[PDB]
Design a protein around this nucleic acid. Structure first.
Lengths: 159, 169, 58, 222, 292
RNA sequence: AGCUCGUAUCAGUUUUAUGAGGUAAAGCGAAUGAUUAGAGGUUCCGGGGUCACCUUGACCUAUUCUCAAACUUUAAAUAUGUAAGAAGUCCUUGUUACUUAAUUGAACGUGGACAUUUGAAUGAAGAGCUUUUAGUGGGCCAUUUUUGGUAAGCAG
RNA sequence: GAGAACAGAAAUCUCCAGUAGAACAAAAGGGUAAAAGCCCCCUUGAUUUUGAUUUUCAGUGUGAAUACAAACCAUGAAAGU
RNA sequence: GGUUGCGGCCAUAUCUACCAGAAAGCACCGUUUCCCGUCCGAUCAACUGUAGUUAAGCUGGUAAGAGCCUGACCGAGUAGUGUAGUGGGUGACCAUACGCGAAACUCAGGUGCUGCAAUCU
């Protein structure tokens, strides 16, 4: 009979990183997880209790619950024709803050500072992000940087 | 050279390997008991060998360790029949050294009745003060190259004491 | 006789015809499975909050 | 059982299937000796290095390697004697081929099921090679070059597909080009090791480097 | 010996403090982990350990960048309160427990509340919470790598912190005077050890038995010309002095910071630069090839 | 069949940032498993030959050659999770029978400021929701990945 | 590996190296070094009321497991488990 | 700036040989009445910092050191790969167009940084 057990096909998912076996460092317990923070799931092989399913490895969702030694994480799971609120009860070893919040929050603070300065001097400080616009015209000069030719080289076997 | 970089006799282990268990085992235990002033421990067989009349966990040995003045005096007493000399062999590469006497019960004490006969191995654990650095719990360090004990160091020390020589053969 | 076993063909197109839809998250989501110790604190807290606000507004 | 035509096992259709604890009941490879000729000759004795390189990506059967080795040894040896060359069969027979044993007797359709449980039993060994990989590598004195290339041309006839005779720019079986290996050997940072050489690195404990290569330090100092 | 490069390449070092053996990371994990629904409430540790000719007791809080201390005490501050010799004994442990407890309660503004017990009778008594007021300041004992045994110096500091108005959660099983034929501590034995009973009785015993040991040992006591019976008086005096002003008057720092740093530097070695390394290896290779 | 609204809580999409993976590859002077060839070195755990007598049987050290679906330090492409705000941020003070040593925090808030862009691009064809019911539940092929097989207009 | 009478390849003991090449009931995988391994002490939480959640999935059941709460406990010096 | 206590990152910290360490600190070290534990005060427990020491530990420095980490227009835009073709070839596979883009290697560099508290010629 074909096996679809809880930790099927998990030969490499829970491999502790090379030269990173043993007890995990203590910042993972010393972090704080308030409700509404969005965190990803990097399962830890060493700790057994609270292990997620292999499907949630690498996913990311908000924390809906904070517990004695664990948090409750909401993940969207694509099954059938629509997503579902999968609610995990994860020991705090297998989670860690997703830095997307950190970058978004610091961009929000910087944007608010930009809005304040525009509220004082220099309006239209271009609040939105702008993608990598095409490079505007430039002069490329030729002192010491004389154009030296490059010719295609003959095929040498080198075997 | 240095007041406390010289070798010392931490512990002398005395071993009596009894063939079987029982009254003979108790005899070895009692005799080594009055010899060392302390009760030895029973060394249960590790695995059954099937050729020695010995099954695992069958109490086939009796050994005790001695440290301090008791160890010093009992080493003197051991060598008093070893002729205060040994061989180039019997010296371990780590510094320790040993020798097995064939009898003590009438050799050093009165041969009482109901004791039988017994021979024992002396094995001197020979090193220098400061080796607690590897056996203590907190900050369990490791000794350095110089503080290590070698066979040439131990043979020099064994010349310096006991009026001893090496390579009896 | 021999009937075929499994096939994912056309299933993604079936899933994308009516379109895979988000669950439409709401303000004040369901307080299900959140810590009960926190739940009943929240209970007494909201009771008191509505009391204080309405009493202040008279 | 009669050996199958190699036209069945020409290509690298299946995954590598090596002799392991999962692939237990396997025969042994036909080819056993991989270095031939004066195999203990020092590196400078045989400067020239020639290669018989496959130009495609197929499976070379172990016994085919063995037979081509036989013929390549034969021509070169009877042309320039026993010890004018050293040949090395680079590829190795690790792939274990499978045959689905069958019965072709009278009315075997009864006693045989055909394709039910058609996992084949090990048939033999073959060596997987890709494009550009070297099959044969012969080293010899430069004057031996016509002899070794004609021997390699005779060895090529035992291999399916297209192979080529490439006169490597390297010095023997080494990983250095000829003119700059000449500089290295003259500078003296090369120590023979029975058949090959040891190279002096710019990195390493200088006492160990002095133990192995005094000649380099003397040649620089003088 | 002669470790292979593969081993030294796949060798996973333990955490530095475990490499040096100072910290037990397994127990530290559960010492610093917090009920996650207590988001930013630190788990304060009463870390009391013993380096010879010293005692080191402190209150520590766990932060991401490191452990930040609330208030600390050491042996060499006891002489201010009078305890001159035996600045690492069991009674010294209890005394510095009182000191650090009153010190941290003073720091966080809980002097009048949680006075602890003045006439300590060696009775296991956690500081009871004040009626209609804040609960007592709760800190968690951290012995460290050292073993727990009945009647240990670490648990002397346990009793000191407990009696200094600082609630530590603990049990009396390992206080001295714990029988096993009965589950009751000996309050007399505990209280007597508190004032140096295990030291004073050995004072009088050595004085009766001989004079050579009583003089070679406790020679610092012989300098003060103090017998056994004055130890309890001086400990009571030191306890009251601790209870009076645990203000932590620091040292004078004579020969101050610049002199310290420059003097340490003047004898401190330095790492030779790359040019020095290349020139010295050039000299070494030339010397080794100098027709050797 | 509609219903509630009227340009959105959106997207088989992308960018920025951020993860996650262990395939392709690469690797064995890296672990485990294989492997070809030698070079230099052993205890009275055998020299097999004169009882420590060159004397061969190992093991290690530096190498060299080729590998691995059920090996791997490393590691792509593609595919994939998330976020890119008004359901947010910031300030102050309000409830808690939770938490705190606490008049601490957590949660939920009160009041106050948040247009040029309310915070990436592109599109939005209206968006969201409910009920109900039919047929279907024998599949087939093509490029690419790939399993068994010699291979198949073969089977998966 | 080096040693110690009987005692040799294997009996017991000592020291040294030992990133784990061992052990954890049972297949394989993963994981674990002051421990998840061996020894010693104490126990029964292998208990009750349920409810929620993950996997198989129709987000049904059964099975398995996770995280709590309300109790009562065990252990520990305690956090904690 | 050194040391101690608690640590954060978890080898740029490890490992192997050699050396140095002013003051403080640490350690070794001294002794067993009680607490405590063993066969052994060796570990642990108690007491003194009293007899001394840097011998060791610890710290640090040295090594054309192994390792570890970083970087390179170093290998190499190579291998691989998404997409496309009524492209080549019989095929194995390959060349191209638009993209992404390694690893081993070669070399250069580096060998702990730091937080809180305390203390020191």
């Amino acid at each position: 009979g074909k096996s679809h057990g809880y930790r099927s096909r998990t030969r490499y998912m829970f491999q502790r990183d090379f030269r990173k076996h043993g007890a995990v460092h203590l910042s993972t317990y010393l972090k704080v997880y308030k409700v509404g923070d969005i965190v990803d799931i990097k399962a830890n092989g060493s700790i057994q209790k609270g292990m997620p399913h292999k499907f949630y490895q690498g996913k990311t969702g908000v924390v809906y619950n904070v517990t004695k030694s664990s948090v409750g994480v909401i993940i969207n799971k694509m099954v059938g024709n629509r997503y579902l609120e999968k609610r995990l009860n994860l020991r705090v070893e297998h989670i860690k803050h997703s830095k997307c919040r950190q970058e978004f929050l610091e961009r929000v603070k910087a944007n608010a500072a930009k809005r304040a300065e525009a509220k004082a001097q220099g309006v239209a400080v271009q609040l939105k992000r702008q993608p990598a616009q095409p490079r505007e015209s430039r002069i490329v000069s030729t002192e010491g940087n004389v154009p030296q030719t490059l010719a295609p080289v003959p095929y040498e076997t080198f075997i | 050279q240095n007041p406390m970089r010289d070798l010392k006799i931490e512990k002398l282990v005395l071993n009596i390997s009894v063939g079987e268990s029982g009254d003979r085992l108790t005899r070895a235990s009692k005799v080594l008991e009055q010899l060392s002033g302390q009760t030895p421990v029973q060394s249960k067989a590790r695995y059954t060998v099937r050729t020695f009349g010995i099954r695992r966990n069958e109490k086939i040995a009796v050994h005790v360790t001695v440290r301090g003045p008791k160890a010093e005096e009992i080493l003197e007493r051991g060598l008093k029949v070893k002729e205060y000399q040994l061989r180039d062999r019997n010296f371990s590469a780590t510094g320790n050294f040993g020798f097995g006497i064939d009898e003590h019960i009438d050799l050093g004490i009165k041969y009482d009745p109901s004791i039988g006969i017994f021979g024992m191995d002396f094995y001197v654990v020979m090193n220098r003060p400061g080796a607690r650095v590897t056996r203590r719990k907190r900050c369990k360090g490791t000794v350095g190259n110089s503080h290590k004990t070698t066979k040439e160091d131990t043979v020099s020390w064994f010349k310096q004491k006991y009026d001893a020589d090496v390579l009896d053969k | 006789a021999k009937s075929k076993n499994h096939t994912a063909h056309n299933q993604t197109r079936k899933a994308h015809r009516n379109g895979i839809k988000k669950p439409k998250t709401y303000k004040y989501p369901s307080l299900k499975g959140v810590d009960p110790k926190f739940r009943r604190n929240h209970k007494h807290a909201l009771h008191g909050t509505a009391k204080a606000l309405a009493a202040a507004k008279k | 059982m009669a050996r199958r035509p190699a036209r069945c096992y020409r290509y690298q259709k299946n995954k590598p299937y090596p002799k392991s604890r999962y692939n237990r009941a396997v025969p042994d490879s036909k080819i056993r000796i991989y270095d031939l000729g004066k195999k203990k000759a020092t590196v400078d004795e045989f400067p020239l290095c020639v290669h018989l390189v496959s130009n495609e990506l197929e499976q070379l059967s172990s016994e085919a390697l063995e037979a081509a080795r036989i013929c390549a040894n034969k021509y070169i040896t009877k042309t320039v004697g026993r010890d004018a060359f050293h040949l090395r069969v680079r590829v190795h027979p690790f792939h274990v081929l499978r045959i689905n044993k069958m019965l072709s007797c009278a009315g075997a359709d009864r006693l045989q099921q055909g394709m039910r449980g058609a996992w084949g039993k090990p048939h033999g060994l073959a060596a997987r090679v890709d494009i550009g990989q070297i099959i044969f590598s012969v080293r010899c004195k430069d004057v031996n070059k016509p002899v070794v290339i004609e021997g390699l041309r005779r060895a090529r006839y035992k291999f399916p597909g297209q192979q080529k005779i490439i006169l490597s720019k390297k010095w023997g079986f080494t990983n250095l080009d000829r003119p700059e290996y000449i500089k290295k050997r003259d500078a003296g940072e090369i120590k023979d090791d029975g058949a090959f050489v040891k190279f002096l690195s710019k990195k390493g404990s200088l006492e160990k480097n002095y133990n192995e290569f005094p000649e380099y330090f003397q040649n620089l100092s003088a | 010996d002669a470790k292979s490069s593969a081993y030294s390449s796949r060798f996973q070092t333990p955490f530095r403090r475990r490499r040096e053996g100072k910290t037990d990371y397994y127990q530290r994990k559960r010492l610093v982990t917090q009920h996650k629904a207590k988001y930013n409430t630190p788990k304060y540790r009463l870390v009391v350990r013993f380096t010879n000719k010293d005692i080191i007791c402190q209150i520590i809080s766990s932060t991401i960048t490191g452990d930040v201390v609330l208030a600390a005490a050491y042996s060499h501050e006891l002489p201010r309160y009078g305890i001159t010799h035996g600045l690492t004994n069991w009674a010294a442990a209890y005394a510095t427990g009182l000191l650090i407890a009153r010190r941290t309660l003073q720091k966080l503004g809980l002097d009048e509340t949680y006075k602890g017990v003045e006439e300590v009778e060696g009775e296991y008594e956690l500081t009871e919470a004040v009626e209609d007021g804040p609960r007592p300041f709760k800190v968690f004992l951290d012995i460290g790598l050292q073993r727990t045994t009945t009647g240990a110096r670490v648990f002397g500091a346990l009793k000191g912190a407990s009696d200094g108005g600082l609630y530590v959660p603990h049990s009396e099983n390992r206080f001295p005077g714990w029988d096993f034929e009965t589950e009751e501590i000996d309050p007399e034995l505990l209280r007597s050890y508190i004032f140096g009973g295990h030291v004073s009785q050995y004072m009088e015993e050595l004085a009766d038995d001989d004079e050579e040991r009583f003089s070679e040992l406790f020679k610092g006591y012989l300098a003060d010309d103090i017998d056994a019976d004055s130890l309890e008086d001086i400990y009571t005096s030191a306890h009251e002095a601790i209870r009076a002003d645990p203000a932590f008057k620091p040292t004078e720092k004579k020969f101050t910071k610049e002199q310290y740093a420059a003097e340490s530097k003047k004898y401190r070695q330095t790492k030779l630069s790359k040019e020095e390394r290349a020139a010295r290896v050039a000299a070494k290779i030339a010397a080794l090839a100098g027709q050797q």
